[PDB]
Ligand binder design. Structure first.
Ligand SMILES: *[C@@H]1O[C@H](CO)[C@@H](O[C@@H]2O[C@H](CO)[C@@H](O[C@@H]3O[C@H](CO[C@H]4O[C@H](CO)[C@@H](O)[C@H](O)[C@@H]4O)[C@@H](O)[C@H](O[C@H]4O[C@H](CO)[C@@H](O)[C@H](O)[C@@H]4O)[C@@H]3O)[C@H](O)[C@H]2NC(C)=O)[C@H](O)[C@H]1NC(C)=O
Ligand SMILES: *[C@@H]1O[C@H](CO)[C@@H](O[C@@H]2O[C@H](CO)[C@@H](O)[C@H](O)[C@H]2NC(C)=O)[C@H](O)[C@H]1NC(C)=O
Ligand SMILES: *[C@@H]1O[C@H](CO)[C@@H](O)[C@H](O)[C@H]1NC(C)=O
Ligand SMILES: *[C@@H]1O[C@H](CO)[C@@H](O)[C@H](O)[C@H]1NC(C)=O
Ligand SMILES: *[C@@H]1O[C@H](CO)[C@@H](O)[C@H](O)[C@H]1NC(C)=O
Ligand SMILES: *[C@@H]1O[C@H](CO)[C@@H](O)[C@H](O)[C@H]1NC(C)=O
Ligand SMILES: *[C@@H]1O[C@H](CO)[C@@H](O)[C@H](O)[C@H]1NC(C)=O
Ligand SMILES: *[C@@H]1O[C@H](CO)[C@@H](O)[C@H](O)[C@H]1NC(C)=O
Lengths: 129, 436, 129, 51
């Protein structure tokens, strides 16, 4: 016998479950987050800038339109030597982000400086010839 | 292990503590807090539990109390901006005792036809609003004469507290600590996310917290540190204590001319005997409340410790309990509640008042015509420690006190925390992007 | 023997070198450009509008996500009769933009009115049949 | 000049500061400028003005 909730994750609750299980509701969480007068006016502009900031990076990385996209940057096991299953079936999003917090800027840089650079250079060369 | 590659995810449910501005919301309808601009409330708000995740709450760091502090003061000043200055009413007063002395019957002679229609307009004044002139009769004048220009509050502005809600802006969320035993801080286990808070009325008072929330099936006593005499003790009551306040005097009021196109309201005659303001408090409810409080105090401060002596400490507005029943500010002697260590309160009324502290410009209440009646209940209170003493569990004189008005909102805000949600993150995967 | 700078173009310097060489750092320049209270508030909103304006055109033209995209609009040699190498290996971005400044609105119009129009019409027809 | 100052009452809740007495002889304000540095500066200026 199994008791069930209604439809899907309410809000953020999956943050403490494994990243594997949590991935199920990225569509939910993303939609919810993505979407006196002067103070609110300021807040609105800030919300837009935060919104567009993320969209800029997703655009550049070739990830726009996706909530899950594979890159072409290899994982340097110096960051973490855990296997695929040792991470995804054993660690939460809150825990994972902390584990590699100090590599965020490194990897983000690598995506753009190496892969994006390559994809744009080679793209033109392929279109030319 | 597997060859791992970087994968980008979006919608990652992780967050960090952050401070920002919460939007007001209100059950939409010149009342100070009844701003014309405020978001209508959600008739069906949601709340969801996290359960896999706990969170560190600390009621002493909730910066939302600062937002309320400043915004509330701004709203006060804005509504009462086009109000009447008392500058030409600093004229000295030839006062005698009003026959029945807290009220004087005085005359003056100003403006004496400065392009207007004016006269001596004798009137009644309260002792607490004037300063004696010991070089005269003694005669009196406005206590504000040697300080600042103050205004008579606009008759068209109501001062009834409004239960304003506050909701999270985009990209942020409000977390709530639902642990019944939660005190000043800790890793609250039962943590939920709340779209928008309930309404908190901006009740302003000294020594006792009125018309607030109740404790979770027992008296709960909180502090930053029960050993530190520099901190205060916040007591949240299991059940409230009934108080009924009245101003038996049926007062009239008169508009006087103070200049061309300018009027001022003075206290007029009083119908019937002039009696004292007072509040009636149920000794049963009060004493039983104290019993529960003492039981909890024992947990920290000793099993035979003598507590709750008379009111003392601070200036008259701190030593007296303060509230604003009917728009008039009452300052009552709470000693009658604490006149017996381990009920009718005498009370006086003041009109020149300071919203928590005022510099320069200040507010003078208009006279209220008729009688004042209201009913409320004590839902919490603030205790202060008297200072150094013999370590032995003999005394700890938890006097009423507390003049930092910010605690009247912090006492409710302790339930909530605001965080910023970061949807962008990465993790390894199994394969390379199929790049051409 | 060769002396080298650190990593890549600082900012705009390539503007006076040939467009060929300058193309190398489009990823750099784009990222840098793309990304009291009231005056700044106004500026922020304006920045957003400029940001989105460019994104609108790149979206419509089928160029979103790219810093280099090939269109299907033929070059009218009336605009310039220089060959590929005579432009790209011999002229800077500042110089080039001036040469064809008066054709900007013309070509932009042609991209949308002819190609975009075609791609949307034919797309639906292909999906239908 | 070593000057004092006095706050005076100009209205209810209103004050104004006035110059008070002066301690010591009342002398002129002045500035001391190095003639060496000034003249040498002018020399260079004149040379350029000649152009
Ligand atoms: C803790 O919470 C309680 C409950 O909210 C507060 O007590 C009440 O305070 C309100 C303040 O307005 C009182 O309301 C006033 O009642 C007067 C007479 O009451 C009778 O008539 C009304 C008519 O609607 C009935 O609803 C009511 O039940 C009674 O039958 C009215 O005449 C008043 O309106 C007049 O004054 C206002 C002043 O702003 C004007 O704007 C109006 O236009 C009108 O002229 C007003 O409605 C209410 O009576 C109080 N309750 C009791 C039992 O007395 C406490 O004050 C609060 N404590 C703290 C610390 O905030
Ligand atoms: C009630 O208050 C006490 C005292 O602050 C809390 O106990 C402390 O909690 C902090 C939280 O970071 C810990 O660092 C301390 O080590 C705790 N002290 C002890 C001796 O346990 C207690 O957690 C609070 N209760 C609740 C339910 O929040
Ligand atoms: C990984 O699994 C083991 C199983 O015992 C557990 O002890 C450990 O805590 C897990 N790691 C995480 C991140 O929880
Ligand atoms: C007040 O009135 C009495 C009336 O006799 C008068 O004697 C007294 O001087 C008056 N005081 C002032 C302040 O003028
Ligand atoms: C709190 O109030 C309820 C009201 O019914 C009472 O039953 C309970 O005993 C009180 N708690 C304590 C600690 O006495
Ligand atoms: C306190 O007073 C309010 C006034 O409306 C009332 O609704 C509430 O029930 C009272 N609380 C108790 C414990 O009686
Ligand atoms: C005050 O007294 C007057 C006397 O005529 C009466 O008309 C009025 O109703 C009284 N007001 C109150 C609130 O009792
Ligand atoms: C093209 O190359 C020739 C080579 O001599 C040069 O003179 C000319 O200036 C170049 N064009 C540009 C745009 O510099």
């Amino acid at each position: 016998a199994v008791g069930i909730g209604a439809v899907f994750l309410g809000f953020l609750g999956a943050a403490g479950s494994t990243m594997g299980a949590a991935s199920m509701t990225l569509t939910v969480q993303a939609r919810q987050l993505l979407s006196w007068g002067i103070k609110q006016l300021q807040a609105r502009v800030l919300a837009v800038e935060r919104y567009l900031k993320d969209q800029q990076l997703l655009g550049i990385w070739g990830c726009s339109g996706k909530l899950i996209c594979c890159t072409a940057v290899p994982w340097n096991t110096s960051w973490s030597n855990k296997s695929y299953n040792q991470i995804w079936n054993n660690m939460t999003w809150m825990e994972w982000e902390r584990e590699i917090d100090n590599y965020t800027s490194l990897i983000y840089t690598l995506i753009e400086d190496s892969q994006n650079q390559q994809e744009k250079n080679e793209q033109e060369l392929l279109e030319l010839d | 292990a597997e060859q791992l590659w970087v994968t980008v995810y979006y919608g990652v449910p992780v967050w960090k503590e952050a401070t920002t501005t919460l939007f007001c919301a209100s059950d939409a309808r010149r009342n100070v807090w009844a701003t014309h601009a405020c978001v209508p409330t959600d008739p069906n708000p949601q709340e969801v539990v996290l359960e896999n995740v706990t969170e560190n709450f600390n009621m002493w760091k909730n910066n939302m109390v600062e937002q309320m502090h400043e915004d509330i003061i701004s709203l006060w000043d804005q509504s009462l901006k086009p109000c009447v200055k008392l500058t030409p009413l600093c004229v000295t007063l030839n006062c005698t005792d009003l026959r029945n002395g807290e009220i004087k019957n005085c005359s003056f002679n100003i403006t004496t036809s400065m392009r207007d229609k004016v006269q001596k307009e004798y009137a009644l004044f309260y002792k607490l609003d004037v300063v004696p002139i010991k070089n005269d009769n003694t005669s009196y004048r406005l206590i504000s004469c040697n300080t600042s220009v103050i205004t008579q509050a606009c008759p068209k502005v109501s001062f009834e507290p409004i239960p304003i809600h506050y909701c999270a802006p985009a990209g942020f969320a409000i977390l709530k600590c639902n642990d019944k035993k939660f005190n000043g801080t800790g890793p609250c286990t039962n943590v939920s996310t709340v779209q928008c808070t309930h309404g908190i009325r901006p009740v302003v008072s000294t020594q006792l917290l009125l018309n607030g929330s109740l404790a979770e099936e027992e008296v709960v006593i909180r502090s930053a540190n029960f050993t530190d005499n520099a901190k205060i003790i916040i007591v949240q009551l299991n059940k409230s204590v009934e108080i009924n306040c009245t101003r038996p005097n049926n007062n009239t009021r008169k508009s006087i001319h103070i200049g061309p196109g300018r009027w001022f309201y003075t206290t007029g005659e009083i119908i019937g005997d002039i009696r004292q303001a007072h509040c009636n408090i149920s000794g049963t409810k009060w004493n039983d409340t104290l019993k529960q409080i003492v039981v909890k105090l024992k947990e920290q401060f000793g099993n035979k410790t003598i507590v709750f002596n008379h009111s003392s400490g601070g200036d008259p507005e701190i030593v007296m309990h303060s509230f604003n029943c009917g728009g008039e500010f009452f300052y009552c002697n709470s000693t009658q509640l604490f006149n017996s260590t381990w009920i009718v309160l005498p009370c006086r009324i003041k009109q020149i008042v300071n919203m928590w502290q005022e510099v320069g410009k200040a507010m003078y209440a208009p006279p209220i015509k008729g009688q004042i009646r209201c009913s409320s209940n004590i839902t919490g209170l603030i205790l202060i420690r008297d200072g150094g003493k013999n370590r032995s569990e003999n005394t700890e004189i938890f006097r009423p006190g507390g003049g930092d008005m910010r605690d009247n909102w912090r006492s409710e805000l302790y339930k909530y925390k605001v965080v910023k949600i970061e949807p962008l993150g990465i993790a390894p995967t199994k394969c390379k992007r199929r790049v051409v």
